Design a protein around this motif. Structure first.
Motif, short mmCIF file in Angstrom:
data_model
loop_
_atom_site.label_atom_id
_atom_site.label_comp_id
_atom_site.label_asym_id
_atom_site.label_seq_id
_atom_site.Cartn_x
_atom_site.Cartn_y
_atom_site.Cartn_z
N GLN A 1 0.80 -1.22 0.00
CA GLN A 1 0.00 0.00 0.00
C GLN A 1 0.83 1.27 0.00
O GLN A 1 0.37 2.32 -0.49
CB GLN A 1 -0.94 0.05 1.22
CG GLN A 1 -1.88 -1.13 1.38
CD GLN A 1 -2.85 -1.25 0.24
OE1 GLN A 1 -3.60 -0.32 -0.06
NE2 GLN A 1 -2.85 -2.40 -0.42
N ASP B 1 1.10 -5.35 -4.60
CA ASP B 1 0.81 -4.10 -5.28
C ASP B 1 0.61 -4.32 -6.79
O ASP B 1 0.36 -3.38 -7.54
CB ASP B 1 1.95 -3.09 -5.07
CG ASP B 1 3.29 -3.61 -5.59
OD1 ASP B 1 3.50 -4.84 -5.60
OD2 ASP B 1 4.14 -2.77 -5.98
N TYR C 1 -5.02 3.98 -5.38
CA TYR C 1 -4.89 2.71 -4.67
C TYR C 1 -5.59 1.58 -5.45
O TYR C 1 -6.09 1.80 -6.54
CB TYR C 1 -5.44 2.83 -3.25
CG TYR C 1 -6.88 3.28 -3.20
CD1 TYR C 1 -7.22 4.63 -3.26
CD2 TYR C 1 -7.91 2.35 -3.10
CE1 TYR C 1 -8.54 5.05 -3.23
CE2 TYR C 1 -9.22 2.75 -3.07
CZ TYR C 1 -9.54 4.10 -3.13
OH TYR C 1 -10.86 4.50 -3.10
N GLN C 2 -5.61 0.37 -4.89
CA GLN C 2 -6.18 -0.79 -5.59
C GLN C 2 -7.18 -1.57 -4.73
O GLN C 2 -6.92 -1.83 -3.55
CB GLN C 2 -5.08 -1.75 -6.08
CG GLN C 2 -4.14 -1.18 -7.14
CD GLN C 2 -3.45 -2.26 -7.97
OE1 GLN C 2 -3.31 -2.13 -9.19
NE2 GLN C 2 -3.00 -3.32 -7.32
N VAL C 3 -8.32 -1.92 -5.32
CA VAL C 3 -9.30 -2.78 -4.66
C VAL C 3 -9.77 -3.89 -5.60
O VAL C 3 -9.95 -3.66 -6.80
CB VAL C 3 -10.53 -1.99 -4.15
CG1 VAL C 3 -10.16 -1.10 -2.97
CG2 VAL C 3 -11.16 -1.17 -5.27
N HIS D 1 -13.17 -3.20 2.76
CA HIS D 1 -11.75 -2.97 3.06
C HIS D 1 -10.92 -4.24 2.94
O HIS D 1 -9.71 -4.18 2.73
CB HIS D 1 -11.57 -2.36 4.46
CG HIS D 1 -11.88 -3.29 5.59
ND1 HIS D 1 -11.00 -4.26 6.02
CD2 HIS D 1 -12.97 -3.39 6.39
CE1 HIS D 1 -11.53 -4.92 7.04
NE2 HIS D 1 -12.72 -4.41 7.28
N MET E 1 -8.69 -4.95 -0.22
CA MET E 1 -7.41 -4.29 -0.51
C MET E 1 -6.35 -5.37 -0.66
O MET E 1 -5.21 -5.08 -1.05
CB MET E 1 -7.03 -3.28 0.58
CG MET E 1 -8.07 -2.18 0.79
SD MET E 1 -7.41 -0.61 1.39
CE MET E 1 -6.89 0.16 -0.14
N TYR E 2 -6.74 -6.61 -0.36
CA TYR E 2 -5.89 -7.78 -0.60
C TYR E 2 -6.71 -8.91 -1.20
O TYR E 2 -7.95 -8.81 -1.33
CB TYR E 2 -5.19 -8.24 0.70
CG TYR E 2 -6.09 -8.49 1.90
CD1 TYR E 2 -6.71 -9.73 2.09
CD2 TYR E 2 -6.33 -7.49 2.84
CE1 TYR E 2 -7.54 -9.96 3.18
CE2 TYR E 2 -7.16 -7.71 3.94
CZ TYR E 2 -7.76 -8.95 4.10
OH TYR E 2 -8.58 -9.18 5.19
#
Ligand code: MG
Ligand code: NA
Lengths: 301, 283
Positions: free
Chosen positions: B44, B78, B113-115, B126, B129-130
């Motif tokens: 992140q 990432d 960011y990435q979702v 949340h 995010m992984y």
């Protein structure tokens, strides 16, 4: 009665011949059932199996381990496939804890008031069923040999002292029933050099027989040929490769499966067996091994 | 201190003795050994390396089995896209378990960011995010490949974290390593020596707690040993400590005399490991 003009030979040095010409037995072992139809001996289901094997180049079927439906004898007569019709699996000792198999009936006598017809009734069921089979198909041109058992000493309890005598008796019964064909069996203890298997193979040979060895490799085919020069031999049961249809995400059965399936690559066989390229490699290289009967042509239930 | 959820603000021990003595709050434990979440923060926050990290370690006696003996497999990265593989024990060939791609988000001020927004994403936003897969247990190796948005592989030499976890053997050997193999001879400078407990093939055994003993000789002194285990009340000034979750640390400090430092780490029934630290003088 249906008939066909034809003759065969088994030489200990150069193998098998049909009508004077050498021919390599390219065979499969086949159980009786027809898949989703179960055990039903439907003629077309039967004929389709043979057609599919013929397209593979197969030219001979071993009826493991019991007389075939007459329908299967009809198709091979018509299709030009060589049949080795085996009459028994076990003999007078039951296998695999199967207390109700034919192992318990083999040596029993037939009752006087039992009006069942087909074969000779004066000794045991073994002789009755043996001669009943020979009587139905004695004129079938496809049938080249009578196989009298298969791994008779395997998965049983007790001594095997009695088997060379039981063997010689079955051989005598067959020679007397039909003289035009050699008798044989499939023995898996030759590769372990059991005294009793040596004795039985000699009795086979003395009577114009042909010795089928189950699951010999190249190295074991050769010793048989050396220590027993008079025997004519063949792979009565071979390979036992184990594979699923269409499975490719692993190339071996070297690990333990987790989806209840096995690789489609030819790198998978039972511990006593061999992959398809290996069991054929050993046979094709050796003129004295008349051929092979791969376990199996078709999956069975 | 503050060993929440075993905290206590007055006197007396909490739970049976020895009670948890240090925090569980840290991304990194007291010994400087990263916990798994360390690599979530790295995926992140760090724009200067790439991240591909897998949990859990893959031994039957440390994993959790849920419905259908499925083990929850988690990946911190990432990267734009991840392919997940399985390799059976003793095999050289892997098969594709799964494949998931992130979606890139941009705020008004330009922050990105990435979702994960795929169909089997988590209902709790949340957690996306992984990446998570449920994998049936079986001895062997779980490995991962990472890809950029142009579907170009991101190679292992450009990535931090465990891109594979594997079923290990029994503890076989120690593996020591100094973070700095030369230090100043000022009586202050330190060298941190990470000791790992691994099987015959160098795989860290994830639950190893072997007692490791340190023998220091030369121009330096042992000044600490640690494993970051909260309930571990062993002396920091001893020459021995149980490893925890496969790792133990020793800290050595120089003297004011240039020379070399010899440190050997030993454990019973295990192959020992040695390092050597040189100390340079000051003009
Ligand atoms: Mg207080
Ligand atoms: Na990054």
């Amino acid at each position: 009665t249906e008939y066909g003009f034809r003759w065969t030979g088994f030489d200990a040095t150069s193998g098998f011949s049909l009508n004077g010409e050498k021919v390599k037995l390219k065979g499969v072992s086949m159980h009786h059932d027809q898949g989703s139809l179960g055990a039903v001996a439907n003629r077309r289901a039967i004929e389709r199996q043979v057609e599919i094997l013929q397209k593979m180049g197969v030219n001979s079927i071993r009826t493991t381990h019991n007389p075939a439906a007459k329908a299967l004898i009809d198709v091979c007569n018509e299709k030009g496939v060589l049949v080795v019709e085996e009459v028994f699996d076990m003999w007078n000792r039951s296998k695999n804890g199967n207390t109700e198999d034919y192992g318990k009936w083999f040596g029993q006598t037939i009752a006087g008031d039992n009006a069942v017809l087909g074969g000779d009734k004066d000794e045991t069921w073994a002789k009755f069923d043996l001669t009943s089979t020979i009587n139905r198909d004695r004129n079938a041109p496809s049938v080249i040999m009578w196989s009298l058992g298969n791994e008779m000493m395997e998965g049983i309890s007790g001594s095997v002292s009695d088997f060379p005598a039981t063997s010689a008796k079955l051989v005598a019964w067959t020679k007397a029933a039909d003289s035009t064909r050699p008798m044989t069996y499939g023995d898996n203890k030759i590769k372990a050099n059991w005294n009793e298997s040596n004795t039985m193979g000699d009795n086979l040979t003395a009577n114009g027989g042909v010795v089928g060895t189950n699951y010999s490799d190249g190295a074991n085919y050769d010793k048989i040929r050396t220590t027993h020069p008079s025997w004519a031999i063949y792979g009565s049961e071979t390979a036992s490769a184990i594979n699923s249809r269409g499975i490719y995400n692993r190339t071996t059965g070297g690990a333990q499966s987790s989806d209840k399936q096995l690789t489609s690559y030819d790198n998978s066989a039972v511990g006593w067996g061999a992959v398809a390229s290996s069991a054929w490699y050993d046979v094709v290289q050796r003129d004295f091994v008349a051929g092979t009967y791969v376990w199996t042509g078709f999956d069975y239930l | 201190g503050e060993p929440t959820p075993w905290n206590g603000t007055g006197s007396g021990a909490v739970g049976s003795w020895p009670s948890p003595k240090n925090s569980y709050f840290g991304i990194v434990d007291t010994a400087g050994f990263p916990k798994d979440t360390y690599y979530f923060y790295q995926s992140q926050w760090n724009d200067d390396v790439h991240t591909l990290h897998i949990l859990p370690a893959w031994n039957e006696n440390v994993v959790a089995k849920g419905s259908g003996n499925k083990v929850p497999v988690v990946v911190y990265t990432d990267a734009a896209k991840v392919k997940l593989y399985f390799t059976p024990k003793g095999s050289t060939e892997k098969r594709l378990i799964g494949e998931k791609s992130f979606t890139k988000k941009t705020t008004a001020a330009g922050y990105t960011y990435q979702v994960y927004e795929g169909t089997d994403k988590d209902s709790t936003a949340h957690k996306n995010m992984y990446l998570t897969w449920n994998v049936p247990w079986a001895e062997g190796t779980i490995s991962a490949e990472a890809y950029d948005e142009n579907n170009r592989l991101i190679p292992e030499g450009s990535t931090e974290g465990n891109a594979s976890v594997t079923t290990t053997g029994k503890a076989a050997k120690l593996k020591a390593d100094a973070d700095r193999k030369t230090i100043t001879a000022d009586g202050k400078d330190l060298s941190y020596i990470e000791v790992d407990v691994t099987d015959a093939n160098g795989h860290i055994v994830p639950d190893a707690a072997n007692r490791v003993t340190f023998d220091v000789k030369g121009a330096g002194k042992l000044v600490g040993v640690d494993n970051g285990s909260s309930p571990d009340h062993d002396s920091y000034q001893a020459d021995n400590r149980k490893a925890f979750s496969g790792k133990v640390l020793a800290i050595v400090q120089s003297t004011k005399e240039a020379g070399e430092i010899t440190v050997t780490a030993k454990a019973d029934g295990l192959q020992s490991s040695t390092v050597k630290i040189a100390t340079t003088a000051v003009p």
